[PDB]
Each structure stands twice: as C-alpha cells, then as structure tokens.
Symmetry: C6
Subunit: 161 residues, 6 copies
C-alpha cells in the first residue's frame, strides 16, 4: 500500500517531461531540467526557476468491501529570482504548474512489487487546494506555495491472506 514516494516521483517526472523544451504554447517557462524531490529547503538550490515537491501527512478511511480510500497531500514551493517582476513571475510559474496538473490526463504510477517487477497503475482524482505566496521581505527572492491533494486506491491486499 501507501505508494507515496512513487506518487511523488511520478508527479515530478510528469512536470519535468510535460514542461521542458516543448510546446511553447499553453505551457511557457521552459524549465531546461531541474525539478526534483530529493534536494530542497533553500540552502543549496544554486539555480533558479526551481520548483520543489514536498511530502505531507495523509488520512485514511475504511469502506466495507476491503477497498481502501487514502487521502494524500503534497506541498509545492516555487522560487524565482527577479527578472521582470517577482509577483508576475511567481504567478506565471504557479499557473503553469496548475495547468500541467489539471488539463492533461490522469496521474501514473511506477510501483515496485515485493522483490518483483513494476506493474503500472492509475490514480483516481487530483484536486488543487489554496495556493499562497510569500511577502515583501527577502526582496530579490520570492516563494509560491501550492497545496495539492491526491486520492489513490491501494491494491486490495485483503481477502487474500
């Protein structure tokens, strides 16, 4: 069950593939290559136009058929040095992230079975909750927080002991 790290990896891979070096229309920040989940915080992060994917808490409920409903959360932060205008650039980055989340397809999985092979699976639904930004201080830099939720269905490894 869980699949949390696999979900994060699929998310960052989807952002990278669908955002980089293609389709000037629709999506436009042209991240050459960057986005990841292993390296974050602030210190380090020597480049700009970088966006980070965090890991958050989850919630769970039990349905009376062995099916599992699991709610998962992913905080997303965006950084941009100045260029034209902190507000404009942060809003443009968050808009591109949002459209990549929404308009194209369902989320994909690359789970690894116990000491076996990878069996791809899908993700039921995706919802983007409130998205906030930083304040005036730390003037030349800027932040953009994104709160997104994922609802996956774990494999029913029940009723099969």
């Amino acid at each position: 069950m869980d699949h949390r790290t696999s979900i994060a990896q699929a998310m960052v891979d989807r952002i990278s593939k669908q955002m980089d070096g293609s389709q000037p229309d629709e999506y436009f920040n042209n991240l050459y290559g960057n986005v990841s989940r292993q390296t974050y915080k602030f210190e380090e992060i020597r480049e700009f136009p970088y966006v980070a994917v965090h890991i958050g808490t989850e919630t769970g409920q039990y349905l009376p058929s062995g099916q599992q409903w699991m709610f998962l959360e992913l905080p997303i932060l965006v950084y941009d040095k100045e260029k034209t205008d902190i507000q404009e650039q942060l809003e443009k980055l968050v808009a591109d992230i949002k459209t990549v989340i929404d308009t194209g397809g369902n989320l994909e999985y690359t789970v690894s079975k116990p000491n076996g092979s990878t069996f791809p699976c899908e993700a039921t639904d995706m919802i983007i909750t409130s998205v906030s930004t930083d304040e005036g201080l730390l003037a030349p830099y800027g932040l953009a927080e994104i709160n997104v939720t994922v609802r996956y269905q774990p494999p029913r490894r029940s009723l099969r002991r």
Copy 2:
C-alpha cells in the same frame, strides 16, 4: 487559470483612472497619481494619501462540468497625514474606495495568453468584507484596513 497579479493590476488601473482629478461630485479624494502594489510596507512612500493593495490566499472548488470557481482575497491599506482630523480623512478615503468598488460595472481584465496577445475578459462579482480601523499609537499617521474578495472564472476547462 490562477491569474492573480492581473487582477491586482486591473484593480489598480481602475482605482487610479476612476479617482484622479475628475468628477468632483461623488468622488472626493483627488489623488493626483499614486496607487500601486509594487512598493508598500510603510518604509519608502514619502507622500501620504497613499493606498495600497496586497495579494493573498485564494480557494477553489470543482463544479462537475469542468467549470472552475475560485474566490480570491485582497487586503487594502490606507494611510493619511493630518490635514484636519485623521478619523475623518480615513473614513473619507474608505467611503470613496467602497463607492468606486461597488457602483461601477464589473472589472476589466487583461489576460496574457502564452506567447500571444492580450484578450480582454471580465470579473464576475465584487464583495466587501469587514472594514477595520487603526489605533491611537503612531499618532500623526493612521491606517484603514479593507477586506475585499474576488471570484473570477478562469478561461479554461478540464478534460
């Protein structure tokens, strides 16, 4: 979608063009020219009669046709020095700003399409939430908080 800073720019342009040096009746602050969002806080801003717009969190809901609804928030701050009575000037500014927000039409809007041109759009509705007031301390200056919410439809639909 998103489309926040353009909401801010549209509101700033509307307040600036609607308040400046025209219509002596109805509107009474006569800002020569001023209102912006790039520069705020308190430091700098060497004039008074200065009103500022902030940008804050917005929340969204998913209607079952691919349609989007998003409620956005803007804090408004007003400063004034003392020509006569600080409370009177503050309420004067707040009344004028509320009038300009409410009475005239929907907001004009200036989206910027990917690597293309600007296609004008609208803003659904305007709502004025609580109006706070500053305190006695920092005597010669004064503040007047305004809470306003915006609800726009983002010009895009899901699969």
Copy 3:
C-alpha cells in the same frame, strides 16, 4: 457609504447635550462638558467623570435588492477617580450611559454629501452588549468597559451609476 465617524460624532454630541446641566431626574452625573472622541488613551484627560468612545471593526452583508446591512461596533470606556466608592459611582455613570442610549429616540445623522451640504438621516437600531469592569489594581482609579452595536442602512448608491 460608511458614515462611521459621523455616527461617532452624532452619538457623542447626543450624550453631551442630553446629559449636561438639565433633567436632574432620571439622569445623575451632571457632566459640565467633556465627552469626546478625539482625545483618549489615559495620558492627557486631566479631569475626571470623563467618558470616551472608541472606533471598532464592522461587518457587512449584501441583500439582493441593492440594500446594504452593515453592523458597526463602538467600545466605550469610563474613567473616574474616587469619592464615595469606585464601584458604585462607576456603575452610576454606566447606568446613566445605558439609559441615555436606550430610552430616548433613534439616532441623528449629519453626513456630508460629496462637495455639497448636510442631509440628515437616521440609524435603524441600537443593541447594547456585555458591560465589563476593571480590577482592583490601579486602586484610586477604575474603568468601565461597555460595548455597543449600531445597525445603519448605507445610502443605496447602487442602481444609479
């Protein structure tokens, strides 16, 4: 709209005029002249039997006819030195304040039309909320916190562009 400072000025004028030098019956503080809103805090205020009104937050709701309902709140404090006793004399003050607020008529307005003349208006209702009291410390002095709410109808400057 608003009319907030006009409301405060009208209420303080009502208190001062209706409370001073007249009607020994039903009213007993006989304030020579004092009640105001511009000067408060504690420092200054060299006299006593002084009473001050503050300015507080407001709340607004929109009715589907262009009519506006705005709730306005006014915190009022009373300062009084000694004499007979702090408790009874402060409560005598606040009892006079309550009776002058409730008993006699609705409010009056002296609002200002944009670059024009003053057109008087009325205020719908007054409701008096909790009335707190100070504590033992600062012994020779005492406070009396009284909170009042005002429900006015702003001029319908809508449907007329």
Copy 4:
C-alpha cells in the same frame, strides 16, 4: 438599569445576616462578621474564615415588548486556615454558602432612584455553576471558587 453593585451588596448583606450567630442547625460556620466586597485580593484580610464576592461581566437580550433580560456573574472566593482539614473546612463553607443561596427565597434589593428614595425590589432566580478549588501549593491556606449567576429585570422599559 445595570444595578449590579446593589445586587452584590444585597447578597453580601444576606450572607452576613443569615450566617452570623444564629440557627446552630442548618448553617455551621458561625461567621461573627466579615463578608464584604470592598476589600479583597489576598493581601490584607488578616483573619480567616473570610469569603469574598467579586463583580464580573454581564450579558443582555431584548424581548419584543420593551422588556429587558440581563444575566450576571459573581465569582466567589473562600479562604480557610487549618483547624483540622483544609479540604473539609473549604467544603463546609461552600456547602453553607450554597444552602443560603438556594433554600431561602428570592434576593432582597435596595435600588436608589436618581436623587430620590430607596424603593425595594426583587431578583428573579438564582443559578450556581461549577465549583472549583485550589491546589496543593500554598499549603496552610485554602481556596474554593464559587461561580453563580444572577438574572434581574431592570425596572425600566424602552419606548
């Protein structure tokens, strides 16, 4: 209206008169004389068996005939030293106070009209809420909180 200080004074007079040197049955603290509201806190109060009555926030509601309903609050504090047990003496004082509040009639009242005479009145009903006490520290003395509510009708009506 308001009238709360006279409510407190009447309650103090009632406890003093009903508790002192009379009726060995029912009431057992035999307070010779003490109970007041002018002097409290802890400092001073050199004797013991003292009990104090405070003054607190009140709330009001408007019925549609000009009638007024106002709920009031009185914190009550009891102190005891150590003849035998601090807990026992505290509960004995608390039980006697609750009995005197509950069993006997409505409260008497002594309003003073504006520059006139004293016209006695009544008090509608008595309600006593949670009863808490002190902790281990400050060992030789003891405390016992009493929370009571008062609901009076103000002898006046609106327009």
Copy 5:
C-alpha cells in the same frame, strides 16, 4: 449539599479495605496500608506502590422538581518503583483499581448533618474515563493517570425552608 470529601474518603476507604491483605484471587497488589488523600504531590511519599486521589471541579444542572444532578471528578495517580517492569507494574495496579471501582457495589457515604449525627447515603453511578500513562523520563519511576466521574443526588434541602 456538596458531600465531596465524603466521596473521597469513602472511595479511599473502599480501596483500602477491599484491596488489602485479602482475596488473593481477583485483586493482586496487596497494599499493606497506605492509600490516602491528605498527603500527595511527589515530595514525601517515601514508600511505594502508593496511590493518591485528588479533588477536581464539579458541574451542576437543575431539574424542575427540586432535584439536583451534580457531576464530580476525581483524578487518581499511582507511583511505582522498578521491580520487573515499569509498564507492567503500572498497568497491574491500574487494572486492580479499575476492577475494584467497577465490579463491587455502589459507593457509600459517611456525610455529616449540621451539628448532629452521620446518616449514610448512596451515590447513583460511577464512570471511569480515559486512563493516561507517563513517559520515559524520570526512568525508575512512572505514573498512570486515572480520571473517574461520579453522579450523586444532593439532599433535596429545598421546598423545606
């Protein structure tokens, strides 16, 4: 009314008599003699396997027949000192306390009428709420908090002035 320390003393006497030096089945701590309410806190308490009962707040509601329903709370604490295992011994003691409270009879009373004699009474019900356990720190010692509630009927000393 009240009768609070009557409840506390009856409870502690019940624990003592029903728990000490008898019935090696069912009840298993063999507290030789100890349990009390006057002495607590931590400092002092030189023995061990000691249990202390506190006094807490109460709550009261009024029924329209002169009957009073009063809720009273009693926090209970236990202390133990190594021997086998802290967790085991603490839950050993708390299981004994819980079964003594629950399985055997209703509470008794030794209340005192004004300057008279003792007329025993009863207590309607007992409920035992959440039971917390202490943490690793202060290693050789350990706590296990018990929160119980009682619901007695105060004597209807109303309608009889």
Copy 6:
C-alpha cells in the same frame, strides 16, 4: 480490564515473528531483530532498521448489558539510515508494516490472570489512521510516524 501492556507485547511479537527472515515475497524489510517497547526515544538504538511501539491514552464507553468497549491508541515510529533514499526506505517500511497489520487475522493475546495461568484471547479489530512523515533537518536519519487504534473487550462484566 485495562490490559494495555499485553496488547503491546502481542503487537511486538506479531511484527517480529511475521517480519524476520521468512517469506521473501510480500514482506521486504528482513528485520533480523529489533521491534520492542522497553528501549526507545532515539538515544541508544545504535542500529537503525529499528521500529518502536509506544503506549498512549485510551477511551471507554459503557453499553447497557455490563459489556465494556475500550479504544486504545498506539504511536509507532520507524528510523532508517540511508543506503539509497531515506524517503524510499521509510515508505517501504511503512507499507510493509501496514500490510502486516491489516492482512493477517486478528491479534493473538496472552493475558495473565490474577496469580494464575495465561488464557489466550483475541482482539476485535484493527484500524490505522493518519501516517505522518519526517522533516528535512537531521538529514542522514529519518522518521516515519504510524498511528493505530485498538478496540478490545475486557474479559469481565459488571454487576
């Protein structure tokens, strides 16, 4: 009643026995030996495939036949020490722990009667609530919080 420490022993024994050096399929942590409750905190624990089980507050309700219902809470913490990804190893551990909690039967139980013998019993149902994750700081190590609830009936009835 109560019975918490034996619940903890049953949980630790079950995880240890279902976890060690058997069934390469399904279960992939191969913990040689670790899980316990006597030693925890962080200090000590010089190995870091370790998993710890805590003890928490429980709540009870009274059904009207003398039957008792008790909901118990168990915080579970997992540590790990690199070798590839901290996040990946933590999620693998959490998935394996959730699997072992859910898939196999009700919990076995080993109550000890007063000065008697051990009579095995059962545990009604297992529920796993929210699962938290650690933070960036303290980089080379990792945390993985698990919160589970236990609902056992006490093998005794009231009068």
